[PDB]
Amino acid sequence: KISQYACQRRTTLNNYNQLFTDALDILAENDELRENEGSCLAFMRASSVLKSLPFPITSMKDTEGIPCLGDKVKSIIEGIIEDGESSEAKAVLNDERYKSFKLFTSVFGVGLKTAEKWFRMGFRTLSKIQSDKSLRFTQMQKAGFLYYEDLVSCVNRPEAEAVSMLVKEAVVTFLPDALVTMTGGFRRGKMTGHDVDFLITSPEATEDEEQQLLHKVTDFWKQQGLLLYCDILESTFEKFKQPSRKVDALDHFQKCFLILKLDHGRVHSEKQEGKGWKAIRVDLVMCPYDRRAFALLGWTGSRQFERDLRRYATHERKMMLDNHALYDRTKRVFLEAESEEEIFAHLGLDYIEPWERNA
Ligand SMILES: Nc1ncnc2c1ncn2[C@@H]1O[C@H](COP(=O)(O)CP(=O)(O)OP(=O)(O)O)[C@@H](O)[C@H]1O
Ligand SMILES: [Mn+2]
Ligand SMILES: [Mn+2]
Numbered sequence: 001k002i003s004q005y006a007c008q009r010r011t012t013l014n015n016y017n018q019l020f021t022d023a024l025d026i027l028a029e030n031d032e033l034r035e036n037e038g039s040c041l042a043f044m045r046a047s048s049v050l051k052s053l054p055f056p057i058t059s060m061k062d063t064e065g066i067p068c069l070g071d072k073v074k075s076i077i078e079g080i081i082e083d084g085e086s087s088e089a090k091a092v093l094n095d096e097r098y099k100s101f102k103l104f105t106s107v108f109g110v111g112l113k114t115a116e117k118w119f120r121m122g123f124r125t126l127s128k129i130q131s132d133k134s135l136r137f138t139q140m141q142k143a144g145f146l147y148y149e150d151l152v153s154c155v156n157r158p159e160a161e162a163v164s165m166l167v168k169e170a171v172v173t174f175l176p177d178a179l180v181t182m183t184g185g186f187r188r189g190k191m192t193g194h195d196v197d198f199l200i201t202s203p204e205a206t207e208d209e210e211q212q213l214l215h216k217v218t219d220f221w222k223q224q225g226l227l228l229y230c231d232i233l234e235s236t237f238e239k240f241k242q243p244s245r246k247v248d249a250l251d252h253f254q255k256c257f258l259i260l261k262l263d264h265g266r267v268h269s270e271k272q273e274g275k276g277w278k279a280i281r282v283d284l285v286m287c288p289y290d291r292r293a294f295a296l297l298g299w300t301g302s303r304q305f306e307r308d309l310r311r312y313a314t315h316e317r318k319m320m321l322d323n324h325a326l327y328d329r330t331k332r333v334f335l336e337a338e339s340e341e342e343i344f345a346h347l348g349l350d351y352i353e354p355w356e357r358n359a
């Protein structure tokens, strides 16, 4: 019996149901754009459970006993079994609002509100947006347009590893005892990603040393001429506050959203070609040493795995979980963890490996 929770499922990158899940992911994305949160959630949960299957669905009988598959979802599956296509997802892919939203938000610095604004102004192409003499762009959007081709091309594993070397070299220069971990999609085993994320923590650093590290590391890269974009968000972390009750929990740790210049010579791949460097989106998070397991768990993802982990903790265990802590409402105590395994054990869950969290 397959659980309704992604945190009680093993979801690996060998997806046998991409025909169904690609269609469900498109329908969920459209519901997000149309502000239909409920329908979005139902399609995301259906897509997630099909991603966990160890075999491809080839008939409607194969869907028996699978949770999170409502009547609307089963109609979509039936249509794909019929002729190998989803008429519903095909209509979304041909919709002008959907096409514009996907295209505009593919730019770093452009979200739902700016994409909607440009659509209602009559824009349909990035060429017309960039060349417009009346539009005003944020510093984030300027970087998004300037490095667009590099950012839209996938970051591969040799590039992610080359970035990891740069991050570690910079970090240990100021904090030699610091632990640097690659998180996000690449930690879940992905071959490619839109960015490279890292968790940084130090067992001996002070509160001030912890606060200054991201400033020191980015100033060092600025001096090197490697910092193409930088936004540092100061910490709002509260050591003794209860974890978030929200569906999508906010992270209060100090973090930075960067664009780094990655020289081709630093990349050890099978394959200078052009300008000799590639712009790479990099996110760095700094957390207190005692919260490193909660931060690692939250930053590893996937987003669906994190949502279900927090939902299971609340509804099944009367626990409150987020990127900073785990609180037991029955025992009235915060639960400590030195590893992700200890968090799973506190929750009464079998340990799910990072490459099994692709929900
Ligand atoms: N810029 C950011 N802001 C907030 N959280 C982020 C973040 N980047 C990464 N994370 C966190 O770490 C996980 C990775 O998030 P994302 O970076 O948005 C992409 P991904 O799941 O890593 O695959 P991809 O970036 O390789 O395509 C998420 O669970 C999220 O909570
Ligand atoms: Mn990522
Ligand atoms: Mn990221």
Ligand code: NA
Pocket: 104, 105, 106, 107, 108, 109, 110, 111
């Ligand atoms: Na965007």
